Design an enzyme around this catalytic site. Sequence first.
Site, PDB file in Angstrom:
ATOM      1  N   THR A   1      -7.944  -2.771  -3.309  1.00  0.00           N
ATOM      2  CA  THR A   1      -8.871  -1.630  -3.193  1.00  0.00           C
ATOM      3  C   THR A   1      -9.661  -1.387  -4.491  1.00  0.00           C
ATOM      4  O   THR A   1      -9.935  -0.240  -4.863  1.00  0.00           O
ATOM      5  CB  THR A   1      -8.126  -0.325  -2.743  1.00  0.00           C
ATOM      6  OG1 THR A   1      -7.043  -0.668  -1.857  1.00  0.00           O
ATOM      7  CG2 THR A   1      -9.084   0.640  -2.014  1.00  0.00           C
TER       8      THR A   1
ATOM      9  N   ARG B   1       0.803  -1.216   0.000  1.00  0.00           N
ATOM     10  CA  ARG B   1       0.000   0.000   0.000  1.00  0.00           C
ATOM     11  C   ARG B   1       0.845   1.280   0.000  1.00  0.00           C
ATOM     12  O   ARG B   1       1.659   1.504   0.906  1.00  0.00           O
ATOM     13  CB  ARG B   1      -0.972   0.002   1.191  1.00  0.00           C
ATOM     14  CG  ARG B   1      -1.971   1.154   1.151  1.00  0.00           C
ATOM     15  CD  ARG B   1      -2.656   1.385   2.484  1.00  0.00           C
ATOM     16  NE  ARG B   1      -3.141   2.767   2.571  1.00  0.00           N
ATOM     17  CZ  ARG B   1      -4.175   3.163   3.314  1.00  0.00           C
ATOM     18  NH1 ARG B   1      -4.846   2.272   4.041  1.00  0.00           N
ATOM     19  NH2 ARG B   1      -4.544   4.443   3.328  1.00  0.00           N
TER      20      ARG B   1
ATOM     21  N   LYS C   1     -11.669 -13.255   1.264  1.00  0.00           N
ATOM     22  CA  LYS C   1     -10.908 -12.481   2.235  1.00  0.00           C
ATOM     23  C   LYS C   1     -11.840 -12.097   3.397  1.00  0.00           C
ATOM     24  O   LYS C   1     -12.906 -11.524   3.172  1.00  0.00           O
ATOM     25  CB  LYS C   1     -10.299 -11.248   1.544  1.00  0.00           C
ATOM     26  CG  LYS C   1     -10.021 -10.040   2.435  1.00  0.00           C
ATOM     27  CD  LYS C   1      -9.508  -8.862   1.615  1.00  0.00           C
ATOM     28  CE  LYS C   1      -9.389  -7.609   2.471  1.00  0.00           C
ATOM     29  NZ  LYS C   1      -9.009  -6.391   1.684  1.00  0.00           N
TER      30      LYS C   1
ATOM     31  N   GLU D   1       0.053  -7.786  -4.574  1.00  0.00           N
ATOM     32  CA  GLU D   1      -0.881  -6.786  -5.078  1.00  0.00           C
ATOM     33  C   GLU D   1      -0.558  -5.361  -4.646  1.00  0.00           C
ATOM     34  O   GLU D   1       0.046  -5.134  -3.589  1.00  0.00           O
ATOM     35  CB  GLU D   1      -2.329  -7.173  -4.763  1.00  0.00           C
ATOM     36  CG  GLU D   1      -2.652  -7.329  -3.298  1.00  0.00           C
ATOM     37  CD  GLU D   1      -3.484  -6.184  -2.784  1.00  0.00           C
ATOM     38  OE1 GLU D   1      -4.385  -6.449  -1.951  1.00  0.00           O
ATOM     39  OE2 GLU D   1      -3.236  -5.024  -3.213  1.00  0.00           O
TER      40      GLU D   1
ATOM     41  N   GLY E   1      -4.197  -6.961  10.339  1.00  0.00           N
ATOM     42  CA  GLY E   1      -3.348  -7.162  11.518  1.00  0.00           C
ATOM     43  C   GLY E   1      -2.823  -8.579  11.690  1.00  0.00           C
ATOM     44  O   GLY E   1      -2.824  -9.114  12.800  1.00  0.00           O
TER      45      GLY E   1
ATOM     46  N   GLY F   1      -0.406  -6.680   5.118  1.00  0.00           N
ATOM     47  CA  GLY F   1      -0.411  -5.238   4.894  1.00  0.00           C
ATOM     48  C   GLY F   1       0.737  -4.513   5.562  1.00  0.00           C
ATOM     49  O   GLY F   1       1.905  -4.774   5.267  1.00  0.00           O
ATOM     50  N   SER F   2       0.403  -3.621   6.488  1.00  0.00           N
ATOM     51  CA  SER F   2       1.375  -2.713   7.097  1.00  0.00           C
ATOM     52  C   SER F   2       2.472  -3.387   7.939  1.00  0.00           C
ATOM     53  O   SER F   2       3.509  -2.770   8.197  1.00  0.00           O
ATOM     54  CB  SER F   2       0.664  -1.637   7.921  1.00  0.00           C
ATOM     55  OG  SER F   2       0.294  -2.152   9.181  1.00  0.00           O
TER      56      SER F   2
END
Lengths: 206, 206, 206
Positions: free
Chosen positions: C66, C14, C126, C37, C156, C176-177
């Site tokens: 997204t 992202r 998902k 992605e 998370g 993700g993050s």
Amino acid sequence: MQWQTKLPLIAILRGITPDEALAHVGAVIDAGFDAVEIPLNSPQWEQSIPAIVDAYGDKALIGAGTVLKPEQVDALARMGCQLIVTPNIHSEVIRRAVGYGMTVCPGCATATEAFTALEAGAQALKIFPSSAFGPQYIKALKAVLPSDIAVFAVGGVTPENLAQWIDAGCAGAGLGSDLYRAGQSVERTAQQAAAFVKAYREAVQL
Amino acid sequence: MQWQTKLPLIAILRGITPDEALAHVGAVIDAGFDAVEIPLNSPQWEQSIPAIVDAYGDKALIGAGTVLKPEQVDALARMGCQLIVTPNIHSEVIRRAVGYGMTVCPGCATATEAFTALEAGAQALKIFPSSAFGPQYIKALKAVLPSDIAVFAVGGVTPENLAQWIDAGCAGAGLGSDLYRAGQSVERTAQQAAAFVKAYREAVQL
Amino acid sequence: MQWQTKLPLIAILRGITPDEALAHVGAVIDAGFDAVEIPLNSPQWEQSIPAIVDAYGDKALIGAGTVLKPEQVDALARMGCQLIVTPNIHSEVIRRAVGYGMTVCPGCATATEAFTALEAGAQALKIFPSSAFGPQYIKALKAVLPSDIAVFAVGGVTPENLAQWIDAGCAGAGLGSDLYRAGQSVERTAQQAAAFVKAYREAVQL
């Protein structure tokens, strides 16, 4: 509507076989259950469902779980099924079942899904899966749903935690793997059913 | 859009009566509130809503909660209602209210329901019930919703827990039974409103 | 369907920029990733997505996250995008992507939304956001979804908590993050990717 059986506990017998259906259903009923369902992912439900309707349908509400398609409702109607339980909200499933004069208790997880289910004419609601949400989630919903809606907790309900679903305002609960797992003995079923009924009577008194 | 009032806290007065409406609304406003709603499950909302519009509509955003049907929006419009709050996402309710130039803050629980609400033209979003979900749920959503969407926590928000909804990225919160329960005194309302406002000012500073 | 790549972990990048795309994608792939992605809220995704398709599309499943609108699917198809990830269930997005022969893994939060996604022809699911729900929520769903549905935890997921999503029955997870935040070094990406892969191999063995 309020629940139309003496005891608002639904026995869920996932994966039961035709050869053991009569003994395990007899065991829950002997303990004071009068609402029972057999999920459509159980092997040969087309044999055990009508068998159980004929044997126990005069003294209990008999039905089906995991009902996902309108045409399944049609087949179940001819079998004498009286009760439809579901994991999800599908408007046409609910509409067709209500049309047969069946009791429908469909599964939802949100306020939006719950109001949708009521417009389809659901006479009760299943909150699923209840364990992850906890009792406070249910109480928050009840505060916004019509005051006389019968609401059932489904998903990891135990004799030990049952009282807190009652305190949250549930009319009752649907009981899965903590009541019946496939291949357990009849004695186990009779033991678990007694414990749930006992815990319910204690919770209602309080 | 950002919130269009000085203070992004919605006072929810569930079950208030016409005879006590002016005193309890005056109490929240005296404390610095400028957004107030009366749920349609309150008795005689058709008297207290237009009464409050006339008395306080020049100095506060006045509206209705528990709005479930398009025709309710129509009646509220004639009354001078400026704000619509809901437990669920109903596209036509949102569309009709936006059409009257009303501020709409509808209730959702998932990402799917939230994007649906925005397509209907909702200018704000209510996440309900927030307590069961916790702040991390809200922060996870914010990361995927458009950056300027005003998001409100509703459901068990306290002066003590308010700061963590702020830290999670909420524009504010709607305040229910921890602000007002039916039959509490005016003094209680003035005490709770001051405490929420004080806690908000502390949270924003941090 | 089962997952069609060697390793069921989706690298989510992202906010990555075109100038750093090739180095960070190379780093995840060098570590054993073969599904990647780039979210459409990343700046200049129209440059980095087709760049990465050409550089790494022969040795990895490359796609977009997204994705909210059908017309976005159209543009991504011409770019050579192979994978579509989403926060929500939008039937027409799923249908159009499946029509291009793309792998689609759309985001849902409830049983109702999940069955909707499958009717649109989603080959994977998902669950988002997974952290607030916990592993027991996922296991409860799996018990009612078709037995061979590939289910991914997103939201998370850490190297430390990965094993409990595996134990709950997930085919994998989207990362993700905790794998990539915008402006982190290539070394950080290579360090995090190795740790996730190592934790997965340990979890599958157990």
